[PDB]
């Protein structure tokens, strides 16, 4: 049962991560102010 739970957790994590990356990119594709950002599937860079 522990391994089944861990399998479900890995599945849900990897299914969630693409969704949240898409959501982050959609939110950041809103406005362009003085600060700037960059998003990658596994990376986030912010410039002050």
């Amino acid at each position: 049962e522990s391994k089944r739970l861990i399998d479900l957790s890995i599945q849900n994590y990897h299914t969630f991560l693409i969704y949240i990356t898409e959501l982050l990119k959609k939110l950041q594709s809103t406005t362009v102010m003085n600060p700037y950002m960059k998003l990658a599937p596994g990376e986030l860079t912010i410039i002050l």
Partner: protein, 192 residues
Amino acid sequence: TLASKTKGTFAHRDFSAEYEEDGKYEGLQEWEGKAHLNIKSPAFTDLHLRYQKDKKGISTSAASPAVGTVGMDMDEDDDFSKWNFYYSPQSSPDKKLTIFKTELRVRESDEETQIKVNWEEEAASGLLTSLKDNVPKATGVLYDYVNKYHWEHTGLTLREVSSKLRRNLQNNAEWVYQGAIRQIDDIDVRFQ
């Protein structure tokens, strides 16, 4: 200035602990040196942790055959700061799956600052698989360990303990049953 050299060694029947630390200390937080601990458990998987602190780097890595090698390296500099957290799987010790990475960069021109944070899904899922596969390994080694101690003390297993408890409970229950039957017979006889 302090110069510290310590060695602590413990010896017993299912492992041995050997921790050697050397270093120097100045100021209030000016410590620099190394610290190597080695645990050798015959009953379990061994482990070796190495800590290193110098003025331009703090690297700490723990190597265990069961999990792999978990390390973190911190490099501070006036123009860049680099933090790396990696888990090298035991299957492929050559590669270092960077669990997380942090870059702080200052700009000598204008007024800007770059922060870069990187995470690996592959490293996380691989560590998750390693842990879920070490769970049965830990269960088996602990069960064998407790059985070994049971043999050391009595000379017996655990399932035999279950069977012994069952047979003793059955003997007591049958004693109670026969006591009840003979009591019914006795009370009937004395009533007659």
